Design a protein around this ligand. Structure first.
Ligand SMILES: CC(=O)N[C@@H]1[C@@H](O)[C@H](O[C@H]2O[C@H](CO)[C@@H](O[C@@H]3O[C@H](CO)[C@@H](O[C@@H]4O[C@H](CO)[C@@H](O[C@@H]5O[C@H](CO)[C@@H](O)[C@H](O)[C@H]5NC(C)=O)[C@H](O)[C@H]4NC(C)=O)[C@H](O)[C@H]3NC(C)=O)[C@H](O)[C@H]2NC(C)=O)[C@@H](CO)O[C@H]1O
Ligand SMILES: *[C@@H]1O[C@H](CO)[C@@H](O[C@H]2O[C@H](CO)[C@@H](O[C@H]3O[C@H](CO)[C@@H](O[C@H]4O[C@H](CO)[C@@H](O)[C@H](O)[C@@H]4O)[C@H](O)[C@@H]3O)[C@H](O)[C@H]2NC(C)=O)[C@H](O)[C@H]1NC(C)=O
Length: 361
């Protein structure tokens, strides 16, 4: 079983305890750690933060303590214009330029692979995304001839039926990718006017109409489309999405006035780190959709949909039961990495809970 963990560049700037650097990572926690995100300049891969080469170095030293640890660099991300990916993938010339620039980059900084995070390919991109993957892999293969270990190629993919149908040729890109991370966590949220969980596991006979928004559906579908189970990794979030209630109504259906107030360390409307949620829980009412098997909390006019250890071990058992390749976690820096906010003195409670289930029968 694989455990893919994302580490984000910008978590270094969070004030106080919120600050997270590569060395705060347990080298034996995950099997693969992915650094987010790399840029693209003059159609070539390139750094993003001013100190990436240093953090790159810090991250890859973890492999000195755990030789089995594999690390990857992710390109794209959400603050990256998908139009930009588009312009690069459709011009065979600039596509080849980008592809050629990748191996030496990874090789220099010590990464074991590249992770593509194009969010998201439209209908006019499907044909090229397949091309990019095809050719990118082809290149990694030819580069393994120099006698070094072959680089890995993975991709983060949407879990929205409509999004999948629109820009992904799953049967094709699965032959070439080493593994596929299913973004099974941004199903609600997305500026809606009602309250709802972003990463529910099951549909649950309650409130149907968007019957395709849950991990179970998204998974069964990918399988039906042609992705092999031993190549799928299911995404488990470590953050919650928040909402500012517009009434004293707290149950399913309750109206929303907008996103929730910012976390004290994450400072971003709409999301809270798990550790900020651990703090948010004191004096809040806790509930759990038994249908979808995920919790939510409320306190004042704040409503929070999140994942605790129980819902996470639950998701882990699920992917095991369907014989998936493993779990993907977004992100290490949003979990309680210091392990001083959530009670039980345990570093990385969420990610660990997942690792434990994966380590069992
Ligand atoms: C599987 C997968 O692919 N992952 C998906 C994710 O992409 C999804 O969302 C996530 O992605 C976006 C980015 O794509 C991320 O956005 C980040 O937003 C924060 C603000 O909330 C940005 O924070 C600001 O970052 C800049 C630099 O990065 C900091 O600027 C620096 O400032 C200091 C002094 O303060 C200087 O010393 C530096 O020189 C300076 N300038 C720079 C740019 O170098 C700034 O301090 C910081 N502060 C502020 C104003 O808040 C951050 O940059 C954004 N990321 C990027 C790459 O730009 C978003 O937060 C994240 N979402 C979550 C909740 O994690 C993810 C969503 O769930 O799911 C997957 O699908
Ligand atoms: C990620 O990679 C992006 C795409 O490669 C980077 O995009 C930016 O690149 C340029 C240069 O940084 C931005 O410059 C704009 O403003 C300057 C004035 O401040 C204008 O002058 C430039 O023009 C010439 C190029 O002919 C240079 O010789 C000169 O030195 C100067 O840079 C320039 O014309 C332009 O208007 C540009 O706006 C922007 N392009 C895009 C599409 O993003 C980006 O910087 C990278 N991001 C990070 C964080 O690394």
């Amino acid at each position: 079983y694989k455990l893919i963990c994302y580490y984000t560049s910008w978590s270094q700037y969070r004030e106080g305890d919120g600050s997270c650097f590569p060395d705060a990572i347990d080298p034996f926690l995950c099997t693969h750690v992915i650094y987010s995100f790399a840029n693209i300049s003059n159609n070539e891969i390139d750094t993003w933060e001013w100190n990436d080469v240093t953090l790159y170095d810090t991250l890859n030293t973890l492999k000195n303590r755990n030789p089995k640890l594999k690390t990857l660099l992710s390109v794209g991300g959400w603050n990256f214009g998908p139009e930009r990916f588009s312009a690069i993938a459709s011009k065979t010339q600039s596509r080849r330029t980008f592809i050629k620039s990748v191996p030496p980059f990874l090789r220099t900084h010590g990464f074991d692979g590249l992770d593509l995070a194009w969010l998201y390919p439209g209908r006019r991109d499907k044909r090229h995304l397949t091309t990019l993957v095809k050719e990118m892999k082809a290149e990694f293969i030819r580069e393994a001839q120099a006698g070094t270990e072959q680089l890995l190629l993975s991709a983060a993919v949407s879990a929205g039926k409509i999004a999948i149908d629109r820009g992904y040729d799953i049967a094709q890109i699965s032959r070439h990718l080493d593994f596929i991370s299913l973004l099974t966590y941004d199903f609600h949220g997305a500026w809606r006017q009602t309250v709802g969980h972003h990463s529910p596991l099951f549909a649950g006979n309650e409130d149907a109409s968007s019957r395709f928004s849950n991990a179970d559906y998204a998974v069964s579908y990918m399988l039906r489309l042609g992705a092999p189970a031993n190549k799928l990794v299911m995404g488990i979030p470590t953050f919650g999405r928040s909402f500012t209630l517009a009434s004293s109504k707290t149950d399913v259906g309750a109206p929303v006035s907008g996103p929730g107030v910012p976390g004290r360390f994450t400072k971003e409307k709409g999301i809270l780190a798990y550790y900020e949620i651990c703090d948010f829980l004191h004096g809040a009412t806790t509930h759990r959709f038994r249908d979808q098997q995920v919790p939510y909390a409320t306190k004042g006019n704040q409503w929070v949909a999140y994942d605790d250890q129980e819902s996470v071990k639950n998701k882990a058992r699920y992917l095991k039961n369907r014989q998936l390749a493993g779990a993907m976690v977004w992100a290490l820096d949003l979990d309680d990495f210091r392990g001083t906010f959530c009670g039980q003195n345990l570093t990385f409670p969420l990610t660990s809970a997942v690792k434990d289930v994966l380590a069992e029968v």
